[PDB]
């Protein structure tokens, strides 16, 4: 029952309440319980585990930090990989997620805006 | 119409597409062999338009007031035909297709429609003030149409969202039940006096009726009528 927040530089991953966290701190793996003493650690490439009513969600973390206040836990992990929620099999959000941020963002749109530059530029001299 | 005007009565003369009268005059002049004026118009364009539209005057005995439809050739207003028509005009009403697409039968475009008599020295200071304020708020709404379409309602700031809402309510307020369309629409027509219109629009602009939504203004008459409709 501690306000855990796996926050990444791109987006917030979790903000729920969690029983226990198997934090892989640089000095050594540490567990966190709802009333953990104040703490501030450094993570290393490994797997970070969350216990939610007996359910273990192994978010792979290649590095990051961690601030463990008595009431809330923050994980400013730089990157997350494995995730029982999606992982490799059943992973859907990540699937075509790039296109979800490409066809209307990068892919196509880069050309889409280039077409606007083209057809506008070519008619710019034609009106002169 | 002049027989009835000679009896002191007030006559409305409706001329449909006065431009067709101009074109008929041009064709007659070409047939007679006269030289063609600018844009192949009759040389006597001014005199022909003055023989007409000069008997439409307000005399001591009576008055003839005319509301004439005008076709603008190729939408060219400088065109000497609409130019000579405009030289003899006092009020312009611009019915708009977009306004009529929404179910507002009196689809008069307030911005495009003007009138010479709308000055303080005749219609009174209050009428001029309320008309100018309505024009200003509707012009602001027209300017902000593109902002609303592109960015949305949220980005538009305060003290202007109120103006946009008031402009929408006031353009829905121009709807008015017609005493000739009560059979088709099942709504009795309402005759709104000019003073009642002025006071109702002033009381709509000053802040009253702001809580009332855009509805209850649609096909209504005076502001007291919309208040009663809101209460019921």
């Amino acid at each position: 029952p501690i306000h855990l927040e796996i926050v990444t530089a791109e987006r917030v991953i979790l903000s729920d309440d969690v029983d226990m966290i198997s934090a892989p701190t640089k000095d050594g793996r540490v567990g966190i319980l709802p009333r953990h003493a104040p703490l501030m650690t450094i993570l290393e490439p490994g797997e970070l585990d969350i216990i939610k009513n007996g359910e273990r969600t192994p978010f792979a973390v290649s590095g990051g930090f961690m601030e463990v206040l008595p009431h809330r836990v923050t994980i400013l992990a730089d990157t997350v990989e494995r995730a029982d929620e999606i992982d490799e099999a059943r992973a859907e959000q990540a699937r075509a997620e790039a296109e979800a941020r490409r066809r209307e963002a990068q892919s196509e749109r880069d050309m889409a805006l280039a077409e606007a530059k083209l057809r506008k530029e070519m008619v710019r001299l034609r009106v002169a | 119409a002049e027989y009835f005007r000679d009896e002191g009565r007030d006559i409305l003369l409706f001329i449909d597409n006065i431009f067709r009268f101009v074109q008929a005059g041009s064709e007659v002049s070409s047939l007679l062999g006269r030289m063609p004026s600018q844009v192949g118009y009759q040389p006597t364009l001014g005199t022909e338009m003055g023989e007409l539209q000069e008997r439409i005057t307000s005399t001591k005995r009576g008055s003839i007031t005319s509301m004439q439809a005008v076709y603008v050739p190729a939408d060219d207003y400088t065109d000497p035909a609409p130019a000579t028509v405009f030289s003899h005009l006092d009020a312009t009403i611009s019915l708009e297709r977009s306004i009529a697409e929404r179910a507002i039968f009196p689809a008069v475009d307030p911005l495009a429609s003007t009138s010479r008599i709308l000055d303080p020295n005749i219609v009174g200071e209050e009428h001029y003030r309320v008309a100018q304020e309505v024009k200003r708020v509707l012009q602001r709404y027209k300017d902000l149409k593109d902002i609303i379409a592109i960015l949305g309602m949220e980005e538009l700031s305060d003290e202007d969202k109120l103006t946009v809402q008031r402009a929408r309510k006031i353009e829905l307020f121009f709807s008015q039940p017609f005493t000739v369309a009560q059979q088709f629409t099942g709504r009795p027509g309402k005759y709104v006096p000019v003073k009642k219109t002025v006071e109702s629009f002033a009381r709509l602009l000053n802040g009253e009726g702001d809580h009332i939504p855009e509805s209850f203004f649609y096909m209504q008459g005076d502001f007291d009528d919309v208040l009663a409709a809101y209460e019921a």
Binding site: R103, E104, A105, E108, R109, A112, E115, A116 | -
Partner: protein, 129 residues
């Protein structure tokens, strides 16, 4: 049937400048765009091929209802031709029913509505595009 068609075509025309920017658009704006493209391709017609009134109303009811969305834009004309062939051969009864009550003030009310819906569903099930 044609009121919705006219409205949707007008909406598509008002957004003709965004057609090449279809990727970066709102979902409703996109949907309007491919609906307009489908309708415009439907209006395309060959020469010396006049469609009787029942076929026109059936096809435009199919298009106005969200029934041709799955069909790709370049295949709309083929879909329409095949649907008329289907109604002419497999389902003469629905065509006769549409033609018989084309004058009803509330045309969609009669059972003709369900008959036509069943015909569209059967055709879309049998054929693939």
């Amino acid at each position: 049937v044609a009121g919705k068609l006219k409205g949707e075509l007008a909406q598509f025309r008002d957004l003709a400048a965004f057609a090449q920017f279809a990727s970066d658009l709102d979902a409703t704006t996109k949907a309007q765009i491919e609906r307009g493209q489908r309708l415009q391709e439907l209006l395309k017609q060959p020469q010396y091929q006049p469609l009787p009134v029942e076929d026109q109303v059936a096809v435009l009811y199919a298009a106005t209802n969200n029934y041709l969305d799955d069909v790709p834009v370049p295949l709309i004309t083929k879909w329409r031709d095949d649907f008329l062939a289907f109604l002419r051969t497999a389902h003469p009864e629905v065509r006769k029913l549409i033609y018989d009550n084309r004058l009803d003030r509330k045309f969609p009310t009669p059972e003709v509505k369900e008959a036509l819906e069943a015909a569209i569903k059967e055709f879309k099930a049998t054929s693939n595009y």
